RNA sequence: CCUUCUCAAACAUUCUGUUUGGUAGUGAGUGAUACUCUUUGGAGUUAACUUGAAAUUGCCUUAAA
């Protein structure tokens, strides 16, 4: 499409007028991590999606806390490959949507509210506490039966 | 304590009792379901109540469904306190008119015009707005 | 597990059809009865979608004329309403990829308004009619032992001579005549014939075929058009182009 | 594999590009090394012609699809029109199993079997995933033969076809052949000789033989789509017939099959409706 | 018909009432009520009958609106086909000579994408004073633009004919829009007996005009629908009985 | 996770006019008179302002697996 758009502008712009300004505004999602972090703190970004996975991990640990401090409505969507697909990459890590068509304005606002109710209400707790207490099943059998059988003759 | 009765607000157009029943049955078989509707004009006021049979199946069907984004709505569902109960909520049909009249004879209701005309000319004088005829 | 999105969608989608068919029926009652004070349009219209596509209109004013009706799956997420579903079981259309000939008349036309979104219609040609009846077309027939209700393809003409003796119709080519001419009987020949199991333009679910389905759905959505109008023109299309794919 | 990625991202227009930008295999080198060349190919083209005329007839399904059949119809209706124009039909033999012909295409003689056009039938024991490869091979083989036969005659290949004619019958009268006395005696039978074939008879095996033994045809079967000035003969096969014209001759299509095998022209006092026949006899 | 002296004595004394020593703009606004046997039975009408008048009320509105907060605005709804052809400058060319303006022009798509959602739909439409709509689009509207518009007599859409026979013409739009503007007054017909009209305000026009305005509307409306009595007022007031007819009523039993 | 009735005649030639018909809708809340009816059973209209699609009980199947 980019290639097509370059050819179209040359035919219109030289002959009549304009600085490429004839072409309409582009609305699209913002995929680069550095760019989105830069979009946050302005603060211009209405939604951020953060992939749960990512091999460094340290890369994206700060982003939930940073979004909270700035007050961007963040989410943690499952899978980085999914984010990739919407943005024409193999993997995207984060995706933020900064602008919206007037028709699409209503839908965006209500999604953010859903995310706050669905994510933000229950996850004051999530900041707190330590995951991964869980034991393997052979060890679970051993703890339960020892504890249970000791109590009851 | 919480009851088996359940309160569903924020319902899309074409979420009616047939559908609510057919959906929420899949959690567990239910005693009664009722939607609030307008009289005037037979269509939904976007909230209803169900009541199950078990207590614990109702609060599960609350827990899954409490901020469920659906059309341009999100469904909010509450479980009531003990008792409360589904009281009323009659399923209104659309109300068609009918031209019930006119029993009185023409020579009577002509004199109602002639009298109730002369009411108005006296009435407007009391305001007061001085006027002939 | 049904999900609330589909069950709310189907209620909305059906309610549009139940809204629609009432507007069709109330119009046609006043047209048929003739007490015409207040209606939308005076007479019927037929629209010819063909190859940016050209879109002519004519009023019908019959004059009987040949049509060939095919289901067409659609639209998406609607349960059939009984005033439609009744008519499809009279014309024997039910189950998709299934064709039949019908005689268009002023009396019949108002049916085609109702089944419009569930079928696709148009004028056939004699090569297409010839192609259908001697690639496909299958008789229900009884006699000589056996349980009886049995489907055999049109090989023999003696069977046609026997079961259409009284009309004076002999062999398959006179069936093709009597369909094409719009002559006497017709209906007896068309009930005798039994409706044509056509093949799906695209079966698949491989990555080559999914493309062809995607490119179909655009073309099908472009051709077939759901006005919901009461005074919606019935859509006709190049079946000669279609039955290249379907036969 | 790269299309599945395009769909399984979606991302459709990249798959629509991938559809266009690809180069399908074709067997052209493998034809011309397996048959070098034209007398060797015209030996084995016998075997091709049966299956194309088989697959032309049978109805479109899964395991087949329409395009393979609509190839075979066109490739066969090309082959008929060459044989009809250039007039090579020496032996005819109707059977229960369709109709056998024989044709002497530059030296060697070629037998081949057209089925009757009747709507039947797919058994679903037989493997199509073999036989379609044989069809794909023989479709390309007969393309290269028809290319050579048309240009050497010497008409243009491939021949264009009139649509408004095709919508009457769809057959041999459609296709029209055009440029850049015969071997005898069968060609130029039925010259100055005009047939009016009736509705009931099979048009698909009669018009072929009457055109390929050069004479004019009018069909009743054509008329339903919508002169009888110059018509001599009327082919008809009904029990009773009413009313018949004094100038016109009335015969049964047996006459046409019996005439070609001898190549004499028999008497038309024999045959005729509603009479019993002399038998038929193969020429083999 | 009415004698004009009976209108003049009423409507001038209505100036003596309305003066004295939102609310200010509501209180001064005139109406004319008219009663009859029964309008369009068993069937609601979302039409507007365009009644013939000598003087406009919209041209008087435009001048008085410039002072007020509410701000006068005209709207045109058109087909999906038409907005490709029509532009702002083409309307701006011809409409300035006789002297009106179209504020915006809207696609039938834009209601079913950009001004769906009801906050946005109300916030859009409650601006505009005169809505106009293409003959073909009209009948699709009350699903699209929705009910809160039709509750008023202002924001309900008026029909206008774009097409000359056949397919679009600019002149037929741009000459007819004048007729629906300045020559003609909108009013919707309900069920039942009653029918008010938004006649005008009182800042707008003169009492010399208003009687000539009323006299043509009375002569229009008597002949159509067989009427009982007519009742002019301003907003607060008790009604002024200016016409009153018995010979209608003797038909009403004769049906039953 | 569906997507909304996007023209129809008749007369007359004004480079398109004139006349007639075709439009069921979000729910909730607030308030200020008038008119038509029937007999208290209050039914039908009506000068508009607030509102995030807001809310608590007015008694057919190859669109598969």
From Swiss-Prot, chain A:
Location relative to the cell: Cytoplasm
Principal location class: cytoplasm
Keywords: Cytoplasm, Ribonucleoprotein, Ribosomal protein
GO cellular component: cytosol; cytosolic large ribosomal subunit
GO biological process, one term: cytoplasmic translation
Keyword Cell inner membrane: no
Note: Present with 238000 molecules/cell in log phase SD medium. There are 2 genes for eL8 in yeast.
Functional note: Component of the ribosome, a large ribonucleoprotein complex responsible for the synthesis of proteins in the cell. The small ribosomal subunit (SSU) binds messenger RNAs (mRNAs) and translates the encoded message by selecting cognate aminoacyl-transfer RNA (tRNA) molecules. The large subunit (LSU) contains the ribosomal catalytic site termed the peptidyl transferase center (PTC), which catalyzes the formation of peptide bonds, thereby polymerizing the amino acids delivered by tRNAs into a polypeptide chain.
Known partners and oligomeric status: Component of the large ribosomal subunit (LSU). Mature yeast ribosomes consist of a small (40S) and a large (60S) subunit. The 40S small subunit contains 1 molecule of ribosomal RNA (18S rRNA) and 33 different proteins (encoded by 57 genes). The large 60S subunit contains 3 rRNA molecules (25S, 5.8S and 5S rRNA) and 46 different proteins (encoded by 81 genes).
Protein name, UniProt field: Large ribosomal subunit protein eL8A
Organism name: Saccharomyces cerevisiae (strain ATCC 204508 / S288c) (Baker's yeast)
Gene: RPL8A
Complete-protein stretch covered: 104 to 256 of 256
From Swiss-Prot, chain B:
Residues of the RRM domain: 4-82
Main location: cytoplasm
Knockout-associated phenotype: Essential gene. Abrupt growth arrest prior to substantial depletion of ribosomal subunits. Fails to synthesize the 25S and 5.8S rRNA components of the 60S ribosomal subunit, and exonucleolytic 5' processing of 5.8S rRNA is strongly inhibited. Arrests at cytokinesis and fails to assemble a contractile actin ring at the bud neck.
Keyword Nucleus part of the UniProt annotation: yes
Gene Ontology cellular component annotations, sorted alphabetically: cytoplasm; nucleolus; nucleus; preribosome, large subunit precursor
Keywords: Cytoplasm, Nucleus, Ribonucleoprotein, Ribosome biogenesis, RNA-binding, rRNA processing
Compartment(s): Cytoplasm; Nucleus, Nucleolus
GO MF annotations, alphabetized: ribosomal large subunit binding; RNA binding; rRNA binding
Further comment: Present with 4280 molecules/cell in log phase SD medium.
Function: Involved in the biogenesis of the 60S ribosomal subunit. Required for pre-rRNA processing and cytokinesis. Associates with the precursors of the 25S and 5.8S rRNAs.
Subunit structure: Component of the pre-66S ribosomal particle. Interacts with NOP7 and RRP1.
Record's protein name: Ribosome biogenesis protein 15
Species of the source: Saccharomyces cerevisiae (strain ATCC 204508 / S288c) (Baker's yeast)
Source species taxonomy: Eukaryota, Fungi, Dikarya, Ascomycota, Saccharomycotina
Full-protein positions shown: 88 to 220 of 220
From Swiss-Prot, chain C:
Subcellular location: Nucleus, Nucleolus
Primary location: nucleus
Post-translational modification Phosphoserine, affected residues: 203
One GO term (biological process): exonucleolytic trimming to generate mature 5'-end of 5.8S rRNA from tricistronic rRNA transcript (SSU-rRNA, 5.8S rRNA, LSU-rRNA)
Residue runs in coiled coils: none
A Gene Ontology cellular-component term: preribosome, large subunit precursor
Described purpose of this protein according to its UniProt entry: Involved in the biogenesis of the 60S ribosomal subunit. May act as a specificity factor that binds precursor rRNAs and tethers the enzymes that carry out the early 5' to 3' exonucleolytic reactions that generate the mature rRNAs.
The name this protein goes by in its record: Ribosome biogenesis protein RLP7
Annotated source species: Saccharomyces cerevisiae (strain ATCC 204508 / S288c)
Native organism taxonomy: Eukaryota, Fungi, Dikarya, Ascomycota, Saccharomycotina
First and last residues shown, out of full length: 55 to 322 of 322
Curated annotation (Swiss-Prot), chain D:
Name of the gene this protein is made from: NOP7
Protein role: Component of the NOP7 complex, which is required for maturation of the 25S and 5.8S ribosomal RNAs and formation of the 60S ribosome.
Additional record remark: Present with 4530 molecules/cell in log phase SD medium.
Localization: Nucleus, Nucleolus; Nucleus, Nucleoplasm
Family per similarity comment: Belongs to the pescadillo family.
Domain BRCT: 185-273
Residues of the full protein shown: 88 to 460 of 605
Organism: Saccharomyces cerevisiae (strain ATCC 204508 / S288c) (Baker's yeast)
Assembly mode: Component of the NOP7 complex, composed of ERB1, NOP7 and YTM1. The complex is held together by ERB1, which interacts with NOP7 via its N-terminal domain and with YTM1 via a high-affinity interaction between the seven-bladed beta-propeller domains of the 2 proteins. The NOP7 complex associates with the 66S pre-ribosome. Also interacts with NOG1. May also associate with the origin recognition complex (ORC complex).
Region (Sufficient for interaction with ERB1): 1-284
Induction text: Expression is down-regulated prior to the diauxic shift.
Protein's UniProt name: Pescadillo homolog
Phenotype when the gene is knocked out: Essential gene. Reduced assembly of 60S ribosomes and accumulation of halfmer polyribosomes.
């Amino acid at each position: 499409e980019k290639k097509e758009r370059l050819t179209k502008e040359a035919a219109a712009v030289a002959e009549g007028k304009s600085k490429q300004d004839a072409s309409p505004k582009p609305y699209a999602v913002k995929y680069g991590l550095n760019h989105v972090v830069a979009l946050i703190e302005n603060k211009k970004a209405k939604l951020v999606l953060i992939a749960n996975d990512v091999d460094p991990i340290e890369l994206v640990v700060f982003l939930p806390a940073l979004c909270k401090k700035m007050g961007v409505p963040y989410a943690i969507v499952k899978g980085k490959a999914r984010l990739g697909t919407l943005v024409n990459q193999k993997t995207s890590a984060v995706a933020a949507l900064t602008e919206v068509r007037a028709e699409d304005e209503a839908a965006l606002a209500k999604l953010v509210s859903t995310i706050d109710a669905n994510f933000a209400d229950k996850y004051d707790e999530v900041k707190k506490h330590w995951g991964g207490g869980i034991l393997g099943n052979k060890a679970q059998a051993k703890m339960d039966k020892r504890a249970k059988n000791s109590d009851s003759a | 304590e919480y009851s088996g009765i359940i309160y569903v607000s924020r319902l899309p157009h074409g979420f009616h009792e047939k559908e609510l029943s057919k959906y929420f049955a899949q959690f567990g078989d239910l005693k009664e379901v009722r939607l609030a509707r307008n009289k005037k004009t037979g269509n939904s006021r976007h909230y209803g109540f169900l009541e199950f049979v078990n207590k614990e199946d109702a609060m599960i069907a609350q827990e899954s469904m409490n901020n469920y984004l659906l059309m341009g709505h999100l469904l909010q569902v509450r479980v009531l306190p003990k008792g409360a109960k589904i009281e009323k909520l009659y399923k209104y049909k659309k109300r068609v008119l009918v031209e019930k009249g006119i029993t009185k004879p023409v020579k009577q209701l002509k004199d109602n015009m002639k009298q109730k005309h002369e009411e108005r000319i006296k009435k407007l004088a009391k305001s007061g707005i001085e006027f002939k005829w | 597990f049904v999900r609330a999105e589909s069950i709310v969608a189907k209620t909305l989608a059906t309610s549009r059809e139940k809204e629609r068919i009432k507007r069709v029926s109330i119009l046609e009652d006043k047209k048929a009865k003739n007490e015409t004070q207040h209606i939308a349009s005076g007479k019927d219209f037929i629209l010819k979608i063909t190859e940016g596509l050209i879109r002519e209109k004519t009023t019908y004013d019959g004059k009987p004329a040949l049509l060939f009706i095919v289901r067409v799956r659609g639209p998406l997420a609607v349960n059939i309403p009984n005033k439609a579903f009744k008519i499809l079981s009279l014309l024997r259309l039910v189950e998709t990829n299934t064709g039949v000939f019908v005689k268009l008349t002023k009396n019949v036309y108002p049916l085609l308004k109702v089944i419009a979104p569930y079928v696709v219609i148009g004028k056939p040609s004699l090569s297409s009619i010839r192609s259908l009846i001697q690639k496909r077309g299958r008789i229900i027939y009884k006699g000589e032992n056996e349980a009886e209700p049995h489907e055999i393809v049109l090989n023999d003409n003696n069977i046609v001579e026997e079961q259409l003796g009284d009309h004076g119709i002999i062999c398959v080519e006179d069936i093709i005549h009597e369909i094409a001419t719009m002559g006497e009987s017709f209906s007896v020949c068309n009930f005798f014939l039994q409706p044509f199991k056509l093949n799906r333009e695209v079966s698949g679910f491989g990555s080559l075929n999914r493309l062809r389905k995607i490119k179909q759905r655009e073309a099908e959505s472009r051709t077939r058009q759901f006005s919901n109008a009461a005074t919606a023109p019935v859509i006709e299309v190049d079946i000669d182009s279609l039955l290249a794919k379907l036969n | 594999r790269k299309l599945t990625r395009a769909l399984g991202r979606g991302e459709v227009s990249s798959a629509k590009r991938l559809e266009e930008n690809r180069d399908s295999y074709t067997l052209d080198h493998i034809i011309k090394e397996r048959y070098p060349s034209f007398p060797d190919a015209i030996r084995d083209i016998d075997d091709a012609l049966n299956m194309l005329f088989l697959f032309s007839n049978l109805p479109s399904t899964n395991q087949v699809s329409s395009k393979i059949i609509n190839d075979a119809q066109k490739i066969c209706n090309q082959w008929l029109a060459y044989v009809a124009k250039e007039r090579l039909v020496r032996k005819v033999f109707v059977s229960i199993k369709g109709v056998y012909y024989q044709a002497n295409i530059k030296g060697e003689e070629v037998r081949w079997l057209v089925p009757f056009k009747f709507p039947e039938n797919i058994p679903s024991d037989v493997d199509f995933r073999i036989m379609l490869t044989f069809l794909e091979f023989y479709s390309t083989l007969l393309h290269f033969v028809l290319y050579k036969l048309y240009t050497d005659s010497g008409l243009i290949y491939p021949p264009k076809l009139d649509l408004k004619k095709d919508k009457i019958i769809s057959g041999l009268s459609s296709y029209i052949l055009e440029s850049r006395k015969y071997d005898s005696p069968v060609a130029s039978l039925f010259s100055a000789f005009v047939f009016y074939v009736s509705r009931e008879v099979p048009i698909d095996i009669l018009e072929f033989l009457i055109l390929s033994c050069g004479g004019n045809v009018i069909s009743e079967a054509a008329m339903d789509q919508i002169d009888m000035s110059k018509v001599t003969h009327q082919i008809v096969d009904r029990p009773v017939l009413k009313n018949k014209v004094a100038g016109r001759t009335y015969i049964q299509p047996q006459w046409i099959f019996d005439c070609i095998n001898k190549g004499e022209l028999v008497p038309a006092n024999k045959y005729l409706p509603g009479e019993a026949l002399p038998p038929h006899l193969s020429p083999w | 018909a009415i004698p004009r002296e009976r209108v003049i004595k009423a409507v001038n004394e209505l100036i003596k009432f309305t003066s004295k020593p939102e609310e200010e703009l509501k209180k001064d606004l005139q109406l004319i009520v008219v009663n009859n046997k029964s309008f369009t039975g068993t069937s609601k009408s979302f039409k507007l009958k365009l009644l013939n008048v000598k003087h406009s009320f919209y041209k008087p509105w435009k001048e008085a609106s410039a002072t007020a907060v509410k701000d006068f605005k005209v709207l045109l709804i058109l087909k999906d086909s038409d907005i490709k052809k029509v532009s702002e400058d083409d309307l701006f060319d011809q409409l300035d000579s006789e002297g009106i303006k179209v504020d915006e022009i809207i696609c039938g798509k834009d209601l079913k994408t950009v001004y769906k959602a009801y906050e946005a739909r109300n916030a859009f439409i409650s601006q505009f004073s005169l809505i106009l709509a293409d003959d073909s689009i009209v009948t699709s509207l009350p699903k699209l633009m929705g009910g809160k518009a039709y509750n008023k007599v202002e924001t309900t859409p008026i029909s206008i004919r774009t097409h000359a026979n056949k397919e679009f013409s600019l002149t037929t739009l741009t000459n007819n829009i004048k007729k629906v503007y300045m020559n003609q007054l909108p009013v919707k017909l309900p069920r039942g007996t009653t029918l008010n009209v938004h006649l005008g305000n009182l800042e707008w026009l003169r009492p010399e005009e208003f009687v000539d305005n009323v006299e043509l509307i009375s002569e229009q409306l008597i002949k159509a629908y067989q009427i009982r009595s007519i009742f002019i007022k301003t907003n607060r007031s008790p009604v002024l009985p200016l016409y009153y007819n018995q010979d209608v009523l003797d038909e009403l039993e004769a049906k039953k």
